[PDB]
């Protein structure tokens, strides 16, 4: 029984988990992201973004084009189910979303949209 998860993004461009599980009982789910690194947001910034596996590449590509000022995320991206802000060393940010937005049978992935990061900083979020 739980409806939250704590996640860390470090100076080595890694999340401390590649798989998140969400209990179907949860009406809402919360992700608590933190950055235990010493590097600045402009060189090793991280955010936690959720979308379907099929929408990831698009969110990432458009995110990079949107730039640092937009936390590397296209404004009001309909493909984004949930998103934290872009954080740097010592920062934290939480995001809560409705579990109803997730439909079983569908593949969901979480990732960081800072340029190049999704290559390593990505994982699955499933609902069972």
User: Rule CB under 5 A: which residues touch Cu ion?
Assistant: 46, 112, 114, 117
Binding-site entries for Cu cation: 46, 112, 117, 121
Q: Of 58 and 115, which has the nearer Cβ to Cu ion?
A: 115
Smallest gap from Cβ 5 to Cu ion, in A, equals 17
Q: Of 108 and 114, which has the nearer Cβ to Cu ion?
A: 114
Binding-site entries: 46, 112, 117, 121
Q: Of 17 and 28, which has the nearer Cβ to Cu ion?
A: 17
3-state secondary structure of 16: coil
Measured between alpha carbons, how far is 119 from 56 in angstroms, rounded to an integer?
11
Which position's Cβ is nearest Cu ion?
A: 112
Smallest gap from Cβ 75 to Cu ion, in A, equals 19
Smallest gap from Cβ 70 to Cu ion, in A, equals 15
């Amino acid at each position: 029984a739980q409806c939250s998860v704590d996640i860390q993004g470090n100076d080595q461009m890694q999340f401390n988990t590649n798989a998140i599980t969400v209990d179907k009982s949860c009406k809402q789910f919360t992700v608590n992201l933190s950055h235990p690194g010493n590097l600045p947001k402009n060189v090793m910034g991280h955010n936690w973004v959720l979308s379907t596996a099929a929408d990831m590449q698009g969110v990432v590509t458009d995110g990079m084009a949107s730039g640092l000022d937009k936390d590397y995320l296209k404004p009001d991206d309909s493909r984004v189910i949930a998103q934290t802000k872009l954080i740097g060393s010592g920062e934290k940010d939480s995001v809560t979303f409705d579990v109803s937005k997730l439909k079983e049978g569908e593949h969901y992935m979480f990732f960081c949209t800072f340029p190049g990061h999704s290559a390593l900083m990505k994982g699955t979020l499933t609902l069972k």
